[PDB]
Amino acid sequence: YRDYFVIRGGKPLTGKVKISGAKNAALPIMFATILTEEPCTITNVPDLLDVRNTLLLLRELGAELEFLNNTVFINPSINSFITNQEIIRRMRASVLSLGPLLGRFGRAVVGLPGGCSIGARPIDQHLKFFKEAGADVEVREGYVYVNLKEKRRVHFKFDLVTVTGTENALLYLASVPEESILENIALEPEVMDLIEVLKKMGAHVKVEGRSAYVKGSENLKGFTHSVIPDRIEAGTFMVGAVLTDGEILLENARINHLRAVVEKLKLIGGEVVEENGNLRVFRKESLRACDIETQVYPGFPTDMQAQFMALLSVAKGKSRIKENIFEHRFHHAQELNRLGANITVRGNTAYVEGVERLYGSEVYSTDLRASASLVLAGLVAQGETVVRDVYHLDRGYEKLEEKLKKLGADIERVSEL
Ligand SMILES: CC(=O)N[C@H]1[C@@H](OP(=O)(O)OP(=O)(O)OC[C@H]2O[C@@H](n3ccc(=O)[nH]c3=O)[C@H](O)[C@@H]2O)O[C@H](CO)[C@@H](O)[C@@H]1O[C@H](C)C(=O)O
C-alpha cells in the first residue's frame, strides 16, 4: 500500500510511551514452535507486518494459530517443509524456518533470499553451517534443497558474527540429541531470548564468551514465553526525546539491552534516568557531534545508526558515523540531505556536519528500521515533512505514529492504496 505520514514539525515529545515486544525476538521464537508438536503460547508479541507474515508462513506450513492481544497461541501441526519464494521475498528472515524444518523432518525446501535494499546480504554462513552439520545442500529453481541423512553432533565456527545465522544453527541443534558446539556466535538480546525458549523446550544451552554448547532433544516440549521488549524501538524514542528537546518516560523497556545507545546519547547531550524500570529521557546539554561505529551487540546497533544520524544532523560539529555491519546502509543520509542536512558519504563512513535547522519536504522510507530516522527528522524540520511508503515502518514498529501522537507529535497518517 501507499500510505504515508505528514509530520508538521516543531513540538517537543513529552509524556509516557509503552515499548512493544521485540520483533526480532518474536520471529525466531515463533519459528522455534516448529520443533515441537505441543501447543505453545507467546506473549508480548508486537502486531506489525513481519510478525503477521511469519504467522502466515506457519499457517502455510500447517500450524493452527491465533493472534490476539499481542499473544500468539499455536498448535504446531506442521505438515509441510516448503517455505515458498514469495514469503522469502517479503521477508528474508523467513530463512529461519530452515533450521526447525530440518530438525523436524530431516529435509527442507526454502526459497533463497534475493538482494535487499540494506545490502546483498548473502546467507553463506547459514548454508555453510548446514553443510558442516552433514546435510546435502543444493540450490535449484531458486530454492535451497536440504536433506539430512542422519543427525549427528556438530562443531562449527562462524567466519563472521551473524544474528540469524546463529539462530538458525541453534534452532537445528536444539533438535539433535548430542553435544554440539558453536563458536563466534551473535550475543544479541534476541538471540539470548530464543535460547531461553529452546531451554524451556528441553534443550540444554550454555553460553560462554561467543561459544554456545548445545545438547538437543528429539522430544521437545511446548512452551509459554513473554518476549523481551524491543530495544530498537526504545532507542528510537530516546533519540526522539533528545532531538526534540522534550521529556519522555519509557515504560517496559530494559536498560540492560541499551548500554551502547545510552552511552552515545549522553555524549551527544542527552540524559537517561532510571526510575524503577522506567527510563526518563531528556536533553541535558546543547547537542554536540560524536563519532559512532556500528558493531555487533553489545556494541552500537546498526539498527540505531540512522536515528542517531538524524539527531547529529542538527548537533554542533562534524560527526563520523561508520558502518561495520551493513556498510551499504546509508540511503537515509541523502533523504536527510533533502531536509537541509549536510551529510557526506565516503565508502562505509558518513560524515555529518551539523546544521542549525532542517527544512521539511518529501522523503521516502526504504528500510523497516532505519527509515524511522526520517520520521524523527520530520519532528524538528521547519514546516512539513511527508514520509512516503510507511509500509516499511509498519514492518518494523508497532503503532509508531500513534505512540508519537500520544507524545505530542503533530503527525498523521494518510491511507493510500
Ligand atoms: C530477523 C532479524 O533478526 N534481523 C536482524 C539481523 O539480520 P541478520 O541478517 O541476521 O544480520 P547478520 O547476519 O548478523 O548480518 C551482519 C553482516 O554479516 C553479513 N553476512 C551475514 C550472514 C551470512 O551468511 N553472510 C554474510 O555475509 C551480512 O551481509 C551483514 O553485512 O541482525 C541485523 C544486525 O543486527 C539486524 O539489522 C536485522 O534487522 C533487520 C533490519 C530486520 O529487522 O528485518
Side-chain angles (χ1 to χ4, degrees):
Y1 47 85
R2 299 205 304 166
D3 295 15
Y4 61 91
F5 296 159
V6 177
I7 305 168
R8 303 196 170 77
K11 290 294 182 61
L13 297 182
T14 66
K16 303 177 178 202
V17 57
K18 192 171 199 296
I19 297 306
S20 296
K23 173 180 87 71
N24 291 342
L27 259 47
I29 286 171
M30 282 186 283
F31 284 114
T33 67
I34 294 174
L35 297 172
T36 182
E37 295 194 79
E38 302 183 1
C40 301
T41 297
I42 314 165
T43 193
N44 199 35
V45 174
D47 186 2
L48 41 71
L49 298 180
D50 279 7
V51 163
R52 286 199 177 278
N53 281 324
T54 300
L55 295 176
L56 178 56
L57 175 52
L58 291 170
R59 280 173 167 160
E60 299 302 317
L61 291 173
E64 165 182 59
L65 62 82
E66 291 190 317
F67 181 36
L68 302 164
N69 303 314
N70 298 97
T71 297
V72 176
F73 298 100
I74 178 174
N75 163 26
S77 46
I78 307 297
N79 61 7
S80 172
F81 51 78
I82 303 173
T83 294
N84 75 61
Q85 193 60 50
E86 176 173 60
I87 297 175
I88 285 284
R89 280 283 185 185
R90 265 139 104 200
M91 187 184 84
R92 71 198 303 105
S94 300
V95 160
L96 283 171
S97 63
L98 183 53
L101 286 174
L102 198 68
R104 180 165 185 145
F105 301 114
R107 54 176 52 191
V109 184
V110 181
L112 192 78
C116 165
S117 69
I118 296 175
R121 297 182 67 188
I123 56 163
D124 57 292
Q125 295 294 295
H126 298 236
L127 303 181
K128 188 175 186 178
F129 167 75
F130 290 110
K131 288 171 185 183
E132 173 67 46
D136 291 301
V137 180
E138 307 173 13
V139 179
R140 303 283 191 285
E141 304 282 321
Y143 281 85
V144 187
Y145 286 81
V146 188
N147 183 69
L148 191 63
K149 294 179 181 179
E150 68 166 56
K151 291 181 179 179
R152 72 183 189 199
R153 68 176 299 288
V154 187
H155 184 174
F156 180 77
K157 184 188 176 186
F158 287 93
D159 295 320
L160 53 88
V161 176
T162 170
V163 174
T164 55
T166 290
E167 299 169 345
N168 229 342
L170 289 169
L171 286 159
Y172 170 69
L173 296 178
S175 74
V176 175
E178 280 170 50
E179 291 290 358
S180 297
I181 305 179
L182 295 179
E183 288 178 48
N184 201 33
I185 66 162
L187 295 178
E188 272 66 12
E190 298 76 25
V191 177
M192 298 300 116
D193 204 26
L194 164 67
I195 288 179
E196 171 165 40
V197 164
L198 298 174
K199 297 191 303 193
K200 286 185 170 178
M201 295 180 80
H204 293 181
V205 182
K206 168 199 167 56
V207 179
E208 59 166 48
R210 286 185 183 271
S211 294
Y213 295 89
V214 185
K215 174 68 180 310
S217 177
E218 299 184 297
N219 302 294
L220 296 166
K221 307 148 50 184
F223 67 88
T224 295
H225 188 78
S226 180
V227 305
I228 57 168
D230 197 301
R231 67 205 165 84
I232 301 304
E233 181 189 18
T236 296
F237 279 101
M238 295 187 135
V239 168
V242 180
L243 176 57
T244 65
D245 197 14
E247 189 189 333
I248 68 179
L249 185 71
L250 290 73
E251 302 173 303
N252 298 162
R254 300 292 181 263
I255 185 63
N256 291 336
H257 293 165
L258 294 162
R259 186 181 183 188
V261 170
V262 170
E263 177 183 298
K264 293 300 183 180
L265 196 70
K266 289 184 173 197
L267 284 176
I268 293 167
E271 178 64 274
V272 175
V273 176
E274 198 176 17
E275 299 182 350
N276 281 46
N278 299 326
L279 301 171
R280 186 173 298 280
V281 188
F282 58 94
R283 186 192 296 183
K284 183 175 57 182
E285 309 298 327
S286 63
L287 303 184
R288 68 214 47 190
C290 181
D291 289 353
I292 300 177
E293 290 209 21
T294 63
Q295 297 183 285
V296 295
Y297 190 85
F300 187 93
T302 172
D303 288 331
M304 288 302 309
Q305 177 252 114
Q307 298 91 314
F308 273 70
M309 180 180 287
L311 172 59
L312 293 165
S313 70
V314 291
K316 184 184 179 179
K318 182 179 175 178
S319 297
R320 181 183 63 98
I321 297 174
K322 178 176 182 185
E323 268 282 1
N324 288 300
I325 307 299
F326 289 125
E327 290 97 330
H328 137 159
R329 204 181 195 182
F330 289 118
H331 189 285
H332 51 272
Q334 185 54 25
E335 296 296 315
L336 289 170
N337 280 334
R338 283 184 41 65
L339 302 178
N342 185 4
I343 304 164
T344 53
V345 181
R346 313 296 172 73
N348 59 18
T349 303
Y351 296 92
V352 184
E353 297 168 68
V355 295
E356 188 174 309
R357 66 198 54 173
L358 299 179
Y359 297 96
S361 68
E362 183 187 61
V363 292
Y364 276 77
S365 298
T366 59
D367 186 314
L368 72 171
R369 250 68 206 282
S371 292
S373 65
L374 307 178
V375 169
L376 288 172
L379 295 175
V380 303
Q382 179 174 293
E384 308 188 341
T385 298
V386 172
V387 184
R388 304 295 299 280
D389 296 342
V390 300
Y391 161 89
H392 294 285
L393 297 173
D394 293 335
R395 286 180 61 182
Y397 300 93
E398 177 177 42
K399 296 180 65 186
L400 179 63
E401 61 277 31
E402 291 88 348
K403 292 180 182 187
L404 288 168
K405 172 66 175 177
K406 171 174 188 163
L407 291 170
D410 292 336
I411 186 173
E412 69 175 305
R413 173 185 196 116
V414 175
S415 294
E416 188 178 63
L417 288 162

Coordinates of all heavy atoms in Angstrom, one line a residue, residues 104-161:
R104 N 12.9 -31.1 12.4 CA 11.7 -31.9 12.5 C 11.5 -33.0 11.4 O 11.0 -34.1 11.8 CB 10.5 -30.9 12.4 CG 9.1 -31.6 12.5 CD 8.1 -30.6 12.7 NE 6.8 -31.2 13.0 CZ 5.9 -30.7 13.8 NH1 6.1 -29.6 14.5 NH2 4.7 -31.3 13.9
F105 N 11.9 -32.7 10.2 CA 11.7 -33.6 9.1 C 12.9 -34.2 8.5 O 12.8 -35.2 7.7 CB 10.9 -33.0 8.0 CG 9.5 -32.5 8.4 CD1 9.3 -31.1 8.5 CD2 8.6 -33.4 8.8 CE1 8.0 -30.7 8.8 CE2 7.3 -33.0 9.1 CZ 7.0 -31.6 9.1
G106 N 14.1 -33.6 8.8 CA 15.3 -34.2 8.1 C 15.5 -33.6 6.7 O 16.4 -34.0 6.0
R107 N 14.5 -32.8 6.3 CA 14.6 -32.1 5.0 C 13.9 -30.8 5.0 O 13.0 -30.6 5.8 CB 14.1 -33.1 3.9 CG 12.8 -33.7 4.1 CD 12.4 -34.5 2.9 NE 13.5 -35.4 2.6 CZ 13.5 -36.1 1.4 NH1 12.6 -36.0 0.5 NH2 14.5 -37.0 1.2
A108 N 14.2 -30.0 4.0 CA 13.6 -28.7 3.9 C 13.8 -28.1 2.5 O 14.8 -28.4 1.8 CB 14.1 -27.7 5.0
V109 N 12.9 -27.3 2.0 CA 13.0 -26.7 0.7 C 12.6 -25.2 1.0 O 11.4 -24.9 1.2 CB 12.0 -27.3 -0.3 CG1 12.3 -26.7 -1.7 CG2 12.3 -28.8 -0.4
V110 N 13.6 -24.3 1.0 CA 13.4 -22.9 1.4 C 13.9 -22.0 0.3 O 15.0 -22.1 -0.2 CB 14.1 -22.6 2.7 CG1 13.9 -21.2 3.1 CG2 13.6 -23.6 3.8
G111 N 13.0 -21.1 -0.1 CA 13.4 -20.1 -1.1 C 14.7 -19.4 -0.7 O 14.8 -19.0 0.4
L112 N 15.6 -19.1 -1.7 CA 16.8 -18.4 -1.4 C 16.5 -16.9 -1.5 O 16.0 -16.4 -2.4 CB 17.9 -18.7 -2.3 CG 19.3 -18.2 -1.8 CD1 19.8 -19.1 -0.7 CD2 20.4 -18.1 -2.9
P113 N 16.9 -16.1 -0.4 CA 16.6 -14.7 -0.4 C 17.3 -14.0 -1.6 O 18.3 -14.5 -2.1 CB 17.3 -14.2 0.9 CG 17.2 -15.4 1.8 CD 17.5 -16.5 0.9
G114 N 16.7 -12.9 -2.1 CA 17.3 -12.2 -3.2 C 18.1 -11.0 -2.5 O 18.2 -11.1 -1.3
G115 N 18.5 -10.0 -3.3 CA 19.2 -8.9 -2.7 C 18.2 -8.1 -1.8 O 17.0 -8.3 -2.0
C116 N 18.7 -7.2 -1.0 CA 17.8 -6.4 -0.1 C 18.3 -4.9 -0.3 O 19.4 -4.7 -0.7 CB 17.9 -6.9 1.3 SG 17.3 -5.8 2.7
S117 N 17.4 -4.0 0.0 CA 17.8 -2.6 -0.1 C 18.9 -2.2 0.9 O 19.7 -1.3 0.6 CB 16.7 -1.6 0.1 OG 16.2 -1.6 1.5
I118 N 19.0 -3.0 2.0 CA 20.1 -2.7 3.0 C 21.4 -3.3 2.6 O 22.5 -2.9 3.1 CB 19.6 -3.4 4.3 CG1 18.3 -2.7 4.9 CG2 20.7 -3.3 5.4 CD1 17.7 -3.4 6.1
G119 N 21.4 -4.2 1.6 CA 22.6 -4.8 1.1 C 22.3 -6.2 0.4 O 21.2 -6.7 0.5
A120 N 23.3 -6.8 -0.2 CA 23.2 -8.1 -0.9 C 22.7 -9.1 0.2 O 21.9 -9.9 -0.1 CB 24.5 -8.5 -1.6
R121 N 23.4 -9.0 1.3 CA 23.0 -9.9 2.5 C 23.0 -11.4 2.2 O 21.9 -12.0 2.3 CB 21.7 -9.4 3.1 CG 21.9 -8.0 3.7 CD 20.6 -7.5 4.3 NE 20.2 -8.2 5.6 CZ 19.1 -8.1 6.2 NH1 18.2 -7.2 5.8 NH2 18.8 -8.7 7.4
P122 N 24.1 -12.0 1.7 CA 24.1 -13.4 1.4 C 23.9 -14.2 2.7 O 24.2 -13.7 3.8 CB 25.4 -13.6 0.7 CG 26.3 -12.5 1.2 CD 25.4 -11.3 1.5
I123 N 23.6 -15.5 2.5 CA 23.5 -16.4 3.7 C 24.4 -17.5 3.7 O 24.1 -18.6 4.1 CB 22.0 -16.9 3.8 CG1 21.6 -17.7 2.5 CG2 21.0 -15.8 4.1 CD1 20.3 -18.6 2.7
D124 N 25.6 -17.3 3.1 CA 26.6 -18.3 3.0 C 26.9 -19.0 4.3 O 27.2 -20.2 4.4 CB 27.9 -17.7 2.4 CG 28.5 -16.6 3.2 OD1 27.8 -15.5 3.2 OD2 29.6 -16.7 3.9
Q125 N 26.9 -18.2 5.4 CA 27.2 -18.8 6.7 C 26.1 -19.8 7.2 O 26.4 -20.8 7.8 CB 27.3 -17.7 7.8 CG 28.6 -16.8 7.5 CD 29.9 -17.5 7.7 OE1 30.2 -18.0 8.8 NE2 30.6 -17.7 6.6
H126 N 24.8 -19.5 6.8 CA 23.8 -20.4 7.2 C 24.0 -21.7 6.4 O 23.9 -22.8 7.0 CB 22.4 -19.9 6.8 CG 22.0 -18.6 7.4 ND1 20.8 -18.5 8.1 CD2 22.5 -17.3 7.4 CE1 20.6 -17.2 8.5 NE2 21.7 -16.5 8.1
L127 N 24.2 -21.6 5.1 CA 24.4 -22.8 4.3 C 25.7 -23.5 4.7 O 25.7 -24.7 4.7 CB 24.4 -22.4 2.8 CG 23.1 -21.7 2.3 CD1 23.2 -21.4 0.8 CD2 21.9 -22.5 2.7
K128 N 26.7 -22.8 5.0 CA 28.0 -23.4 5.4 C 27.7 -24.2 6.7 O 28.2 -25.3 6.8 CB 29.0 -22.4 5.6 CG 30.4 -22.9 5.9 CD 31.5 -21.8 6.0 CE 32.9 -22.4 6.1 NZ 33.9 -21.3 6.1
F129 N 27.0 -23.7 7.6 CA 26.7 -24.4 8.9 C 26.0 -25.7 8.6 O 26.4 -26.8 9.1 CB 25.8 -23.6 9.8 CG 25.2 -24.4 11.0 CD1 26.1 -24.8 12.0 CD2 23.9 -24.9 10.9 CE1 25.6 -25.7 13.0 CE2 23.5 -25.8 11.9 CZ 24.3 -26.2 12.9
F130 N 24.9 -25.7 7.8 CA 24.2 -26.9 7.5 C 25.0 -27.9 6.8 O 24.9 -29.1 7.0 CB 22.9 -26.6 6.8 CG 21.9 -25.9 7.7 CD1 21.5 -24.6 7.5 CD2 21.3 -26.6 8.7 CE1 20.7 -23.9 8.4 CE2 20.4 -25.9 9.6 CZ 20.1 -24.6 9.4
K131 N 26.0 -27.5 5.9 CA 26.8 -28.4 5.2 C 27.7 -29.1 6.3 O 27.9 -30.3 6.3 CB 27.7 -27.8 4.2 CG 26.8 -27.3 3.0 CD 27.7 -26.5 2.0 CE 26.9 -26.0 0.8 NZ 27.8 -25.2 -0.1
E132 N 28.3 -28.3 7.2 CA 29.1 -28.8 8.2 C 28.3 -29.8 9.2 O 28.9 -30.7 9.8 CB 29.7 -27.7 9.1 CG 30.5 -28.1 10.3 CD 31.8 -28.8 10.0 OE1 32.5 -28.3 9.1 OE2 32.1 -29.8 10.7
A133 N 27.0 -29.6 9.3 CA 26.2 -30.4 10.1 C 25.9 -31.8 9.4 O 25.3 -32.7 10.0 CB 24.9 -29.7 10.4
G134 N 26.4 -31.9 8.2 CA 26.3 -33.1 7.4 C 25.1 -33.2 6.4 O 24.8 -34.2 5.8
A135 N 24.4 -32.0 6.2 CA 23.3 -32.0 5.3 C 23.8 -31.9 3.8 O 24.8 -31.3 3.6 CB 22.3 -30.9 5.7
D136 N 23.0 -32.4 2.9 CA 23.3 -32.2 1.5 C 22.5 -31.0 1.1 O 21.3 -30.9 1.4 CB 22.7 -33.4 0.7 CG 23.5 -34.7 1.0 OD1 24.7 -34.7 0.8 OD2 22.9 -35.7 1.4
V137 N 23.2 -30.0 0.6 CA 22.6 -28.7 0.3 C 22.8 -28.4 -1.2 O 23.9 -28.4 -1.7 CB 23.2 -27.6 1.1 CG1 22.6 -26.2 0.7 CG2 23.1 -27.9 2.6
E138 N 21.7 -28.1 -1.9 CA 21.7 -27.8 -3.3 C 20.8 -26.7 -3.7 O 19.7 -26.7 -3.1 CB 21.4 -29.0 -4.1 CG 22.2 -30.3 -3.8 CD 21.7 -31.5 -4.5 OE1 20.9 -31.4 -5.4 OE2 22.2 -32.6 -4.1
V139 N 21.2 -25.8 -4.5 CA 20.3 -24.7 -5.0 C 19.8 -25.0 -6.4 O 20.6 -25.2 -7.3 CB 21.1 -23.3 -5.0 CG1 20.2 -22.2 -5.5 CG2 21.7 -23.0 -3.6
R140 N 18.5 -25.1 -6.5 CA 17.8 -25.3 -7.8 C 16.5 -24.6 -7.8 O 15.8 -24.5 -6.8 CB 17.5 -26.8 -7.9 CG 18.7 -27.8 -7.8 CD 19.6 -27.8 -9.0 NE 20.5 -28.9 -9.0 CZ 21.7 -28.8 -8.2 NH1 22.0 -27.8 -7.5 NH2 22.5 -29.9 -8.3
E141 N 16.2 -24.1 -8.9 CA 14.9 -23.3 -9.1 C 14.8 -22.2 -8.1 O 13.7 -21.8 -7.7 CB 13.7 -24.3 -8.9 CG 13.7 -25.5 -9.8 CD 13.2 -25.2 -11.2 OE1 12.3 -24.3 -11.4 OE2 13.8 -25.7 -12.2
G142 N 15.9 -21.7 -7.7 CA 15.9 -20.6 -6.7 C 15.6 -21.0 -5.3 O 15.3 -20.1 -4.4
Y143 N 15.6 -22.3 -5.0 CA 15.3 -22.8 -3.7 C 16.5 -23.6 -3.1 O 17.3 -24.1 -3.9 CB 14.1 -23.8 -3.7 CG 12.8 -23.2 -3.8 CD1 12.2 -22.8 -5.0 CD2 12.0 -23.0 -2.7 CE1 11.0 -22.2 -5.1 CE2 10.8 -22.4 -2.7 CZ 10.2 -22.0 -3.9 OH 9.0 -21.4 -4.0
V144 N 16.6 -23.6 -1.8 CA 17.7 -24.3 -1.2 C 17.1 -25.6 -0.8 O 16.2 -25.6 0.0 CB 18.2 -23.6 0.1 CG1 19.5 -24.4 0.6 CG2 18.5 -22.2 -0.2
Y145 N 17.6 -26.7 -1.4 CA 17.1 -28.1 -1.0 C 18.1 -28.6 0.0 O 19.2 -28.8 -0.3 CB 17.1 -29.0 -2.2 CG 15.9 -28.7 -3.2 CD1 16.1 -27.6 -4.1 CD2 14.7 -29.4 -3.2 CE1 15.0 -27.3 -5.0 CE2 13.7 -29.1 -4.1 CZ 13.9 -28.1 -5.0 OH 12.8 -27.7 -5.8
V146 N 17.6 -29.0 1.2 CA 18.4 -29.5 2.2 C 17.9 -30.9 2.7 O 16.7 -31.0 3.0 CB 18.5 -28.5 3.4 CG1 19.6 -29.0 4.4 CG2 18.8 -27.1 2.9
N147 N 18.8 -31.8 2.7 CA 18.5 -33.2 3.1 C 19.5 -33.7 4.0 O 20.7 -33.6 3.8 CB 18.4 -34.1 1.8 CG 17.9 -35.5 2.2 OD1 16.8 -35.7 2.6 ND2 18.9 -36.5 2.1
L148 N 19.0 -34.3 5.1 CA 19.8 -34.8 6.2 C 19.7 -36.3 6.3 O 18.6 -36.8 6.6 CB 19.4 -34.1 7.5 CG 20.3 -34.2 8.8 CD1 21.7 -33.6 8.5 CD2 19.5 -33.5 9.9
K149 N 20.7 -37.0 6.1 CA 20.7 -38.5 6.2 C 20.5 -38.9 7.6 O 19.9 -39.9 7.9 CB 21.9 -39.1 5.6 CG 22.0 -38.9 4.1 CD 23.2 -39.5 3.4 CE 23.3 -39.2 1.9 NZ 24.5 -39.7 1.3
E150 N 21.2 -38.2 8.6 CA 21.1 -38.5 10.0 C 21.6 -37.4 10.8 O 22.6 -36.7 10.4 CB 21.9 -39.8 10.3 CG 23.4 -39.7 10.1 CD 24.2 -40.9 10.7 OE1 23.9 -42.0 10.4 OE2 25.0 -40.6 11.6
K151 N 21.1 -37.2 12.0 CA 21.5 -36.2 12.9 C 22.8 -36.6 13.6 O 22.9 -37.7 14.1 CB 20.4 -35.8 14.0 CG 19.2 -35.1 13.4 CD 18.2 -34.9 14.5 CE 17.0 -34.1 14.0 NZ 16.1 -33.9 15.2
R152 N 23.7 -35.7 13.7 CA 25.0 -36.0 14.4 C 25.5 -34.8 15.0 O 25.0 -33.7 14.7 CB 26.0 -36.5 13.3 CG 26.5 -35.4 12.4 CD 27.5 -35.9 11.4 NE 28.1 -34.8 10.7 CZ 28.8 -34.8 9.5 NH1 28.8 -36.0 8.9 NH2 29.3 -33.8 9.0
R153 N 26.4 -34.9 16.0 CA 26.9 -33.7 16.7 C 27.6 -32.8 15.7 O 28.1 -33.3 14.6 CB 27.9 -34.1 17.8 CG 29.2 -34.7 17.3 CD 30.1 -35.0 18.5 NE 30.4 -33.8 19.3 CZ 31.3 -32.8 18.8 NH1 31.8 -32.9 17.6 NH2 31.5 -31.8 19.6
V154 N 27.7 -31.5 16.0 CA 28.3 -30.6 15.1 C 29.2 -29.7 15.9 O 28.9 -29.3 17.0 CB 27.2 -29.7 14.4 CG1 27.9 -28.8 13.3 CG2 26.1 -30.6 13.8
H155 N 30.3 -29.3 15.3 CA 31.2 -28.3 15.9 C 31.5 -27.4 14.7 O 32.1 -27.7 13.7 CB 32.5 -29.0 16.3 CG 33.4 -28.0 17.0 ND1 34.6 -28.4 17.6 CD2 33.3 -26.7 17.2 CE1 35.2 -27.3 18.2 NE2 34.5 -26.3 17.9
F156 N 30.9 -26.2 14.9 CA 31.1 -25.2 13.8 C 31.4 -23.8 14.3 O 30.9 -23.3 15.3 CB 29.7 -25.1 13.1 CG 29.7 -24.1 12.0 CD1 30.3 -24.3 10.8 CD2 29.1 -22.8 12.1 CE1 30.4 -23.4 9.7 CE2 29.1 -21.9 11.1 CZ 29.7 -22.2 9.9
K157 N 32.3 -23.1 13.6 CA 32.7 -21.8 13.9 C 32.3 -20.8 12.8 O 32.7 -21.0 11.6 CB 34.3 -21.7 14.1 CG 34.7 -20.3 14.6 CD 36.2 -20.2 14.6 CE 36.7 -18.8 15.0 NZ 38.2 -18.5 14.9
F158 N 31.6 -19.8 13.1 CA 31.2 -18.8 12.1 C 32.3 -17.9 11.7 O 33.1 -17.5 12.5 CB 30.1 -17.9 12.7 CG 28.7 -18.6 12.8 CD1 28.4 -19.2 14.0 CD2 27.8 -18.6 11.8 CE1 27.2 -19.8 14.2 CE2 26.6 -19.3 11.9 CZ 26.3 -19.9 13.1
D159 N 32.4 -17.7 10.4 CA 33.5 -16.9 9.8 C 33.3 -15.4 10.2 O 34.3 -14.6 10.2 CB 33.6 -17.0 8.3 CG 33.9 -18.4 7.9 OD1 34.8 -19.0 8.5 OD2 33.3 -18.8 6.8
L160 N 32.1 -15.1 10.5 CA 31.7 -13.7 10.9 C 30.5 -13.8 11.8 O 29.8 -14.8 11.8 CB 31.4 -12.9 9.6 CG 30.3 -13.5 8.6 CD1 28.9 -13.0 9.1 CD2 30.6 -13.0 7.2
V161 N 30.3 -12.8 12.6 CA 29.1 -12.8 13.6 C 27.8 -12.5 12.8 O 27.7 -11.4 12.2 CB 29.3 -11.8 14.7 CG1 28.1 -11.8 15.7 CG2 30.6 -12.2 15.6

